[model samples]
Target: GWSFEEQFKQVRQLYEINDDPKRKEFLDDLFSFMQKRGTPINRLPIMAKSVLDLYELYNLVIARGGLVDVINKKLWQEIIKGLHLPSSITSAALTLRTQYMKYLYPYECEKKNLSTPAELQAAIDGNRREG
Candidate 1:
């Protein structure tokens, strides 16, 4: 495979030749583009509250093993209703705070860390067994 540098050299050489005056002007304008890559399209910006709310519920849902059945009935219902979205800001912050705890709690218990969700959940189950 050829490197992009070599492959693009000829294409870039076109810029050196000034056959058309407007062509160079167009290139200059293009060069002025701040973001010349895949840019985000206009959309409603999600606020911190939404991010926190959504990510919190998602992490909990994933942490709870993705099956909400064992999740407290009210807890599950509230989550569903909230998603119909929860107050994700609190959830995100709480997750950030307890996220470390969640990891380290199991880490301290197992005398090591469980990296994966399933592995960590296994640790959680162990904690649950006695708690």
Candidate 2:
């Protein structure tokens, strides 16, 4: 386990105003740490939350036209692929996926120039009526 200060510094460096160009290195280390041997099951939730946060950060980076190298993208995909949701964690996984969809769906709607309040409400109601 990393010392508290080390972990805090790692996270802070990733988000500092100066912007560490090597932020991806810290992300790689953090993701690797989450899956390392002897990591406590009790720590999984926090690590999982961190993963989602980092995922969102990556999305923001892309949205801003920032470059992400191929290696970093592969590492991120591998980390995502390694995540498994058994029945024990299904509800939690669903919540995370839904949270991601909340972000994605709005972006998609915006891209299509969809009317916000009325169109969105009607779309939701139509979907609800379908099933």
Candidate 3:
């Protein structure tokens, strides 16, 4: 940390501290936490129904204005392997559909109402009749 008078001082100070062995543990913990929370956008795919979330993330990165060196293929493999990030979205479509239905339909369906797709409905109905 530095005074307002020295802008680059904090950067230099951080770099020096980052070199220390003690900071390595702290940095490792921070990276691990970030990886767990799905930072660095290491997530497999982006699932955004609307532009708000995507735009918000872009704005956040722009505000930070920090320069990150391009990650080459080799470095990408190493860092990604080292981080061991987990998948963030388990049921993206289901989650989106649930929210969409709540907003659009807002109605309850009976147990029997849950049926197969339109294409499979006729076949299922005919088979049930035969049984």
Candidate 4:
């Protein structure tokens, strides 16, 4: 049977075993990104298609840490390739959000800006915020 706590502990301990530079670099970038947003992890839209969801967009950060190595390298590579430069915190977050949504819900992402789920309608309603 599956033991959630035991599995969680194992996963936690495994993540502690990594000593790679790339992992540290990825986390440093992710930490910097989170600091700018000023919100809790679960509150953020890691599941959304906006640029604010870095957890999904730049998942390499976690994989580099050995937290998600099972994810296909090609998938992570695609996410990394989707990134735009100069790789600002905002850019990384957006890249993360866009990549996941593009793969998960492409039709929802057809609109130019993903900051909102219905940007086109918002724009028409005059409720959209300028970035």
Clashes of each: 4, 0, 0, 3
Supply candidate 1's per-residue lDDT for 112: 27
Model 2, 85-115: lDDT tens digits are 2334434433433332344333333333323
By TM-score, the candidates rank as 2, 4, 1, 3
Worst 10 contiguous positions by lDDT, candidate 3: 65-74
lDDT of 1 by residue, 34-70 (tens): 1232221122113342222222344344454432222
Every candidate's CA RMSD: 19.0, 12.9, 20.5, 14.4
Q: Give stretches of model 1 more than 4 Å off.
A: 1-52, 70-74, 77-131
Candidate 4 lDDT tens digits, 47-76 = 223223233344443334321221322244
Candidate 3 regions off by >4 Å? Answer: 1-15, 41-131
Model 1 Cα shift for residue 43 (angstroms): 8.5
lDDT of candidate 2 at residue 89, scale 0 to 100: 45
Residue 97, candidate 3: Cα error in Å is: 35
Please provide TM-scores, in order, for all candidate models, with all chains considered together: 0.18, 0.26, 0.18, 0.25
Off by over 4 Å in 2: 1-51, 54-88, 108-131
Identify the candidate with maximal lDDT. 2
Model 1's alpha-carbon lDDT is 0.37
Candidates 2 and 4 compared: the better one by lDDT is 2
